[PDB]
């Protein structure tokens, strides 16, 4: 029936995919060796969206992994739940991009993306009703950003009507790992604004802040951050895999969240997230879910929605609830904070309910916010880009491989028009027409 494929690009994408497949395998009741050993029948009815039945209850994940250096693939194989992935889905080269968008987009991607296309097309035709593609990757690296964007472009060229999600992490100044982050990020955004159906912006700033303040973990390694991202993706997909009182597919969320085709950049959060020593003190009710859902410090981007307006919003709910409480909480939050919601769209919020909660919980929530304050990140990256690009810094690593300055100018211009369009839609006059 409805089908979702997972695509992982680069080291970050591979680790996030590993964590996501771990949590999904736990949710659907399959063991690390690939066979089903669950209890209820609800764990069999909707596993076709992620698994193919091979032999004797063997379910192989419907994923395609990507990289350019063997270390990531070997780490994926050696970890737990590493014996479920099909070896043929490891489309792969062994040279390495090396934090270079041009290397992963023109020199190395050009020969490996054909094998990627073979694998992904065999996968996409291996299903009956493909619901959409799902890609997770980075925008700072070379083999995840460049090759990932090229795959996005090729897939959008081949399958135009299918859906497309992108869980893309963006660089941020407080934690900058490499030096050429703006060069990769600007061109990656230039590609995504034209190819991706919708984007969900992530960054390690908000993940680290969530772990430090909310979870209060001593040592928030990448495992916790990948777990948070995986929980976000699972709560995004939950509606398809389990029955509920109100269903909402990815297309429904996209049409209820995107008012204009270029406004497809969302800021996301998860609820609840509390410390083990502090979970005793707190009440466990739906208002506690909603109140932490709307909090700015719970968001997973380094952009405060308080600095802008909410264009549209969506909330994904899991577990048995009363629709009355959800609806009244949404109405209350929408009516009280009246200045943070754009005026030419009444009822900016979409809601849905699912009857199956994630492991360890009885109820949870996932929030999608299409805000006009997201262009803060784009400006914050473009300033570093135009400061670095002023005197052709690190440029020979790109022009010495085929690119020209015109690509950089076009990426900068596109990013600037995107932020200008977001700004104009923020302060758009409420009640007029021309």
């Amino acid at each position: 029936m409805r089908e979702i494929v997972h695509i992982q690009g680069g080291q970050c994408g591979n680790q996030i995919g590993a964590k996501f497949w771990e949590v999904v395998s736990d949710e659907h009741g399959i063991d690390p060796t690939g066979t089903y050993h669950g209890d209820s029948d609800l764990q069999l009815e909707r596993i076709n969206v992620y698994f193919n039945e091979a032999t004797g209850g063997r379910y192989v994940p419907r994923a395609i992994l990507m990289d350019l250096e063997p270390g990531t693939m070997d780490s994926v194989r050696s970890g737990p739940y590493g014996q479920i992935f099909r070896p043929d889905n490891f489309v792969f080269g062994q040279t390495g991009a090396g934090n270079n968008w041009a290397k992963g987009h023109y020199t190395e991607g050009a020969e490996l993306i054909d094998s990627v296309l073979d694998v992904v097309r065999k996968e996409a035709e291996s299903c009956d009703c493909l619901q959409g593609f799902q890609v997770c990757h980075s925008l700072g690296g070379g083999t995840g950003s460049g090759m990932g964007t090229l795959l996005i472009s090729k897939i959008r060229e081949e399958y135009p009507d299918r859906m497309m999600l992108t869980f893309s992490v963006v660089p941020s100044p407080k934690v900058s790992d490499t030096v050429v982050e703006p060069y990769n990020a600007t061109l990656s955004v230039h590609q995504l604004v034209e190819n991706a159906d919708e984007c969900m912006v992530l960054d390690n700033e908000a993940l680290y802040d969530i772990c430090f303040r909310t979870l209060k973990l001593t040592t928030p390694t990448f495992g916790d951050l990948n777990h948070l991202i995986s929980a976000v993706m699972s709560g995004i997909t939950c509606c398809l895999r389990f029955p509920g009182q109100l269903n909402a597919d990815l297309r429904k969320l996209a049409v209820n969240l995107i008012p204009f085709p270029r406004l497809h950049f969302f800021m996301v959060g998860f609820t609840p997230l509390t410390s083990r020593g502090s979970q005793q003190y707190r009440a466990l009710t739906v208002p506690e879910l909603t109140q932490q859902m709307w909090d700015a410090k719970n968001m997973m981007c380094a952009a405060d929605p308080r600095h802008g307006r909410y264009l549209t919003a969506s909330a994904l709910f899991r577990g048995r609830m009363s629709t009355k409480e959800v609806d009244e909480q949404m109405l209350n939050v929408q009516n009280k904070n009246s200045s943070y919601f754009v005026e030419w769209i009444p009822n900016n919020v979409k809601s849905s309910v699912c009857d199956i909660p994630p492991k360890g919980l009885k109820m949870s929530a996932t929030f999608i916010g299409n805000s006009t304050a997201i262009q803060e990140m784009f400006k914050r990256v473009s300033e570093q880009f135009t400061a670095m690009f002023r005197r052709k810094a690190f440029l020979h690593w790109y022009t010495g491989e085929g690119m020209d300055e015109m690509e950089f100018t076009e990426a900068e211009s596109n990013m600037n028009d995107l932020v200008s369009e977001y700004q104009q839609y923020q302060d758009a006059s409420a009640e007029e027409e021309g």
């Binding site: 466990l284 577990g319 492991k359 360890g360």
Partner: protein, 52 residues
């Protein structure tokens, strides 16, 4: 005889109403536990499981 029939029916109907009262009170108590969130210890073991 007609009047005694009415008094029998209302007495019968009153018994159903009282039984309905107890059933509703049971449902409200049941919904209190079902609609209340709670965190299992297996949820907290998810964090800090890898070094990286």
């Amino acid at each position: 005889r007609v009047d005694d029939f009415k008094k029998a029916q209302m007495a019968r109907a009153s018994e159903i109403l009282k039984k309905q009262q107890e059933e509703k009170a049971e449902r409200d108590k049941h919904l209190a536990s079902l609609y209340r969130n709670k965190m299992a210890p297996e949820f907290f073991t998810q964090f800090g499981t890898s070094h990286r």
